[PDB]
Design a protein around this motif. Structure first.
Motif, mmCIF file in Angstrom:
data_model
loop_
_atom_site.group_PDB
_atom_site.id
_atom_site.type_symbol
_atom_site.label_atom_id
_atom_site.label_comp_id
_atom_site.label_asym_id
_atom_site.label_seq_id
_atom_site.Cartn_x
_atom_site.Cartn_y
_atom_site.Cartn_z
ATOM 1 N N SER A 401 -20.705 72.068 -11.564
ATOM 2 C CA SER A 401 -19.706 71.119 -11.087
ATOM 3 C C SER A 401 -20.198 70.161 -9.988
ATOM 4 C CB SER A 401 -18.455 71.856 -10.572
ATOM 5 O OG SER A 401 -18.651 72.339 -9.248
ATOM 6 N N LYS A 402 -21.378 70.413 -9.422
ATOM 7 C CA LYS A 402 -21.934 69.517 -8.405
ATOM 8 C C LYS A 402 -23.242 68.897 -8.865
ATOM 9 C CE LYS A 402 -18.677 70.168 -5.489
ATOM 10 N NZ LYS A 402 -17.548 70.781 -6.225
ATOM 11 N N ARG A 403 -23.228 67.578 -9.048
ATOM 12 C CA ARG A 403 -24.401 66.843 -9.515
ATOM 13 C C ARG A 403 -25.145 66.169 -8.369
ATOM 14 N NH1 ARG A 403 -24.287 66.004 -14.969
ATOM 15 N NH2 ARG A 403 -22.388 66.719 -16.048
ATOM 16 N N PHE A 404 -26.375 66.623 -8.126
ATOM 17 C CA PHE A 404 -27.216 66.086 -7.051
ATOM 18 C C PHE A 404 -28.326 65.179 -7.592
ATOM 19 C CE2 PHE A 404 -26.420 67.722 -2.832
ATOM 20 C CZ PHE A 404 -25.571 68.812 -3.046
ATOM 21 N N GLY A 405 -28.476 65.102 -8.907
ATOM 22 C CA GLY A 405 -29.642 64.455 -9.494
ATOM 23 C C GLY A 405 -29.718 62.944 -9.267
ATOM 24 N N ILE A 406 -30.924 62.391 -9.303
ATOM 25 C CA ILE A 406 -31.075 60.956 -9.461
ATOM 26 C C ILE A 406 -31.263 60.690 -10.946
ATOM 27 C CG2 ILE A 406 -31.855 60.565 -7.128
ATOM 28 C CD1 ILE A 406 -34.761 60.500 -8.208
ATOM 29 N N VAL A 407 -31.312 61.781 -11.706
ATOM 30 C CA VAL A 407 -31.246 61.737 -13.155
ATOM 31 C C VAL A 407 -30.046 62.569 -13.605
ATOM 32 C CG1 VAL A 407 -32.395 62.111 -15.378
ATOM 33 C CG2 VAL A 407 -33.743 61.500 -13.301
ATOM 34 N N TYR A 408 -29.186 61.927 -14.386
ATOM 35 C CA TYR A 408 -28.009 62.560 -14.944
ATOM 36 C C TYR A 408 -28.357 63.462 -16.110
ATOM 37 C CZ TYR A 408 -23.272 63.044 -16.813
ATOM 38 O OH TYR A 408 -22.063 63.532 -17.235
ATOM 39 N N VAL A 409 -27.724 64.627 -16.155
ATOM 40 C CA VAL A 409 -27.917 65.501 -17.301
ATOM 41 C C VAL A 409 -26.621 65.724 -18.065
ATOM 42 C CG1 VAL A 409 -28.753 67.704 -18.186
ATOM 43 C CG2 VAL A 409 -29.889 66.626 -16.236
ATOM 44 N N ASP A 410 -26.640 65.327 -19.332
ATOM 45 C CA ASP A 410 -25.542 65.629 -20.232
ATOM 46 C C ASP A 410 -25.803 67.001 -20.806
ATOM 47 O OD1 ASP A 410 -23.692 65.907 -22.392
ATOM 48 O OD2 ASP A 410 -23.596 63.812 -22.747
ATOM 49 N N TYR A 411 -25.068 67.978 -20.312
ATOM 50 C CA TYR A 411 -25.339 69.371 -20.655
ATOM 51 C C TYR A 411 -25.051 69.698 -22.120
ATOM 52 C CZ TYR A 411 -26.043 70.176 -15.668
ATOM 53 O OH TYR A 411 -26.536 70.173 -14.380
ATOM 54 N N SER A 412 -24.081 69.010 -22.715
ATOM 55 C CA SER A 412 -23.773 69.201 -24.141
ATOM 56 C C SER A 412 -24.938 68.835 -25.066
ATOM 57 C CB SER A 412 -22.508 68.429 -24.544
ATOM 58 O OG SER A 412 -22.809 67.070 -24.842
ATOM 59 N N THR A 413 -25.755 67.857 -24.667
ATOM 60 C CA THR A 413 -26.916 67.439 -25.463
ATOM 61 C C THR A 413 -28.269 67.693 -24.792
ATOM 62 O OG1 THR A 413 -26.895 65.148 -24.593
ATOM 63 C CG2 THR A 413 -25.541 65.504 -26.495
ATOM 64 N N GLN A 414 -28.257 67.899 -23.468
ATOM 65 C CA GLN A 414 -29.462 67.921 -22.626
ATOM 66 C C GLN A 414 -30.124 66.550 -22.481
ATOM 67 O OE1 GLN A 414 -30.239 70.120 -20.614
ATOM 68 N NE2 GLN A 414 -29.127 71.937 -21.299
ATOM 69 N N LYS A 415 -29.384 65.489 -22.794
ATOM 70 C CA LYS A 415 -29.865 64.132 -22.587
ATOM 71 C C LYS A 415 -30.047 63.821 -21.096
ATOM 72 C CE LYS A 415 -28.916 59.295 -23.938
ATOM 73 N NZ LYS A 415 -28.492 58.496 -25.140
ATOM 74 N N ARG A 416 -31.167 63.191 -20.753
ATOM 75 C CA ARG A 416 -31.415 62.688 -19.396
ATOM 76 C C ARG A 416 -31.111 61.196 -19.324
ATOM 77 N NH1 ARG A 416 -32.221 68.121 -19.827
ATOM 78 N NH2 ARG A 416 -34.145 68.848 -18.808
ATOM 79 N N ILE A 417 -30.361 60.808 -18.307
ATOM 80 C CA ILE A 417 -30.018 59.414 -18.086
ATOM 81 C C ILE A 417 -30.345 59.087 -16.642
ATOM 82 C CG2 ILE A 417 -28.114 57.714 -18.053
ATOM 83 C CD1 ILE A 417 -26.670 59.450 -20.123
ATOM 84 N N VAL A 418 -31.414 58.319 -16.442
ATOM 85 C CA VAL A 418 -31.810 57.922 -15.107
ATOM 86 C C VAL A 418 -30.669 57.160 -14.460
ATOM 87 C CG1 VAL A 418 -33.522 56.771 -13.648
ATOM 88 C CG2 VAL A 418 -34.233 57.712 -15.884
ATOM 89 N N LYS A 419 -30.271 57.595 -13.278
ATOM 90 C CA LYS A 419 -29.196 56.939 -12.546
ATOM 91 C C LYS A 419 -29.708 55.706 -11.781
ATOM 92 C CE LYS A 419 -27.281 61.603 -11.784
ATOM 93 N NZ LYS A 419 -26.485 62.438 -10.863
ATOM 94 N N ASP A 420 -28.774 54.901 -11.303
ATOM 95 C CA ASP A 420 -29.118 53.716 -10.524
ATOM 96 C C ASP A 420 -29.937 54.148 -9.313
ATOM 97 O OD1 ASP A 420 -27.657 52.312 -12.368
ATOM 98 O OD2 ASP A 420 -26.211 51.457 -11.039
ATOM 99 N N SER A 421 -29.578 55.297 -8.747
ATOM 100 C CA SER A 421 -30.278 55.827 -7.577
ATOM 101 C C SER A 421 -31.729 56.136 -7.911
ATOM 102 C CB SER A 421 -29.567 57.068 -7.023
ATOM 103 O OG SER A 421 -29.508 58.069 -8.007
ATOM 104 N N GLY A 422 -31.976 56.645 -9.110
ATOM 105 C CA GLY A 422 -33.330 56.882 -9.581
ATOM 106 C C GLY A 422 -34.167 55.613 -9.734
ATOM 107 N N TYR A 423 -33.552 54.555 -10.260
ATOM 108 C CA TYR A 423 -34.258 53.285 -10.415
ATOM 109 C C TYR A 423 -34.562 52.734 -9.030
ATOM 110 C CZ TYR A 423 -33.273 53.350 -15.406
ATOM 111 O OH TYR A 423 -33.297 53.665 -16.748
#
Length: 435
Positions: A401-423
């Motif tokens: 329930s707490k997301r700290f990443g600069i990369v988003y993780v879609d747990y249903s697929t395990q897809k990584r989505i680089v966040k604006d903070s990461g860029y």
């Protein structure tokens, strides 16, 4: 502009149990976090690290993300039970193989590995023997540390014994909120003491096995302020790096800690202090939040303030990271300091445009990196800065329930989505500072 020193280490950080999943794969022993999270009522929504970010399988992709973002250092931990399933004795070659592949890949891609030896996933088999409560853990930890040094010390040259030993002892053994979930103040301070002894034994072994490396230790810290114009002095000494650095540098616990906790410490605790003073190469400081505090008849309460907060409800006080950098030089003057963790949880969402527009995280990071820059201009030997975290992950008793990443993780697929903070952070590293 705020340019950092040449060679400044820009990093991201994770921990084994929080990202890996597959806790029992390939002959791994259970850890205390496996058994803790599999116990009903301990973790939000019954979440566990069974799957997490599936980094145990997707490790190469994750590292390629680090490479792609141009991040220069990766702080990660090793799961003790993957390496020694019963904690001591037998070594699991497949555990070694997993980390060997990660290490070789990082070096291939010019990323500097910073290895956390202990980030909370104690082998369950050792917990059955008392875990951190047992004096013998200094031997167990020594043996574990030796295995790591012997196997990886040829390539890994930056090592961290313990992550946040205050949390391990107090949150794990007094508050009962973290594994192993105990509520005993005498156990908790025995754990504080044994953590120090085990840290020091590991540093000793390190001097004997990796003659060209550097080893340190990581502490959680908060920026404590008084509600009115001493309770602040207590909180700093107890909750921040002094609890451990006063022993390591001075050979005793800090004064206000002894006032509060002498009865809870082992009877001849001072006999261990000379061994505890083993020389370290750097201090890691983690920093997230500030707290207004006041006496209250631990005789201290927190006073909620206004201030922007994260999804943790943690108050955002960027000047805390400057304060703690300054304070650490003033009190113990370690030869090197790293910010080994800094970051924020927010309720990220993927927009229709497929991006995560976490301007709130960008602002948080930018503010803190600025304050760390300041500490550098005023003499603090800061050699590096690590964002917690590369990925959204298992946030301990908070679960997913707490997301700290600069990369988003879609747990249903395990897809990584680089966040604006990461860029954004990627630009900071490339430019070696703020602009």
């Amino acid at each position: 502009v705020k340019k950092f020193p040449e060679g400044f280490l820009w990093g991201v950080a994770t921990a084994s149990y929080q990202i890996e999943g597959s806790p029992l794969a390939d002959g791994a022993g259970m850890s205390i976090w496996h058994t803790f999270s599999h116990t009903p009522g301990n973790v939000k929504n019954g979440d566990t690290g069974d799957v997490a970010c599936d980094h145990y399988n997707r490790w190469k992709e994750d590292i390629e993300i680090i490479e792609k973002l141009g991040v220069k250092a990766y702080r990660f931990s090793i799961s003790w039970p993957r390496i020694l399933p019963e904690g001591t004795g037998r070594v699991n070659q497949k555990g070694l193989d997993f980390y060997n592949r990660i290490i070789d890949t990082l070096l291939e891609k010019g990323i500097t590995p910073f290895v956390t030896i202990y980030h909370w996933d104690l082998p369950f088999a050792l917990q059955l023997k008392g875990g951190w409560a047992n004096r013998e853990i200094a031997d167990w930890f020594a043996e574990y540390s030796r295995v790591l040094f012997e196997n990886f010390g040829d390539r890994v040259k930056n090592w961290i014994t313990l992550n946040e030993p205050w949390v391990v002892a107090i949150v794990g053994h007094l508050y009962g909120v973290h594994a192993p979930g105990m509520r005993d103040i005498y156990v908790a301070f025995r754990a504080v003491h044994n953590l120090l002894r085990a840290h020091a034994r590991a540093v000793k072994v390190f001097r004997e096995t990796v003659k060209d490396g550097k080893i340190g230790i990581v502490f959680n810290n908060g920026y404590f302020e008084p509600a009115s114009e001493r309770a602040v002095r207590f909180m700093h000494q107890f909750n921040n790096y002094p609890l451990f650095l006063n022993p390591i540098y001075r050979g005793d616990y800090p004064e206000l800690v002894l006032e509060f906790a002498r009865e809870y410490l082992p009877e001849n605790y001072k006999d261990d202090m000379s061994e505890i003073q083993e020389k370290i190469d750097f201090v890691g400081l983690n920093y997230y939040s500030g707290h207004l505090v006041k006496f209250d008849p631990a005789k201290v309460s927190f006073v909620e303030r206004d201030l922007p907060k994260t999804a943790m409800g943690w108050e955002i006080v960027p000047e805390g990271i400057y304060w703690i950098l300054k304070k650490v030089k003033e009190e113990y003057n370690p030869p090197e300091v790293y910010i080994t963790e800094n970051g924020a949880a927010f309720d990220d969402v993927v927009s229709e445009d497929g991006r995560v527009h976490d301007q709130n995280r960008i602002d948080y990071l930018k503010a803190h990196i600025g304050q760390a820059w300041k500490a550098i201009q005023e003499g603090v030997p800061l050699k590096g800065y690590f964002v917690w975290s590369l990925l959204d992950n298992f946030e301990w008793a908070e679960g997913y329930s707490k997301r700290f990443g600069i990369v988003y993780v879609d747990y249903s697929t395990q897809k990584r989505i680089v966040k604006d903070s990461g860029y954004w952070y990627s630009n900071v590293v490339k430019n070696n500072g703020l602009e």
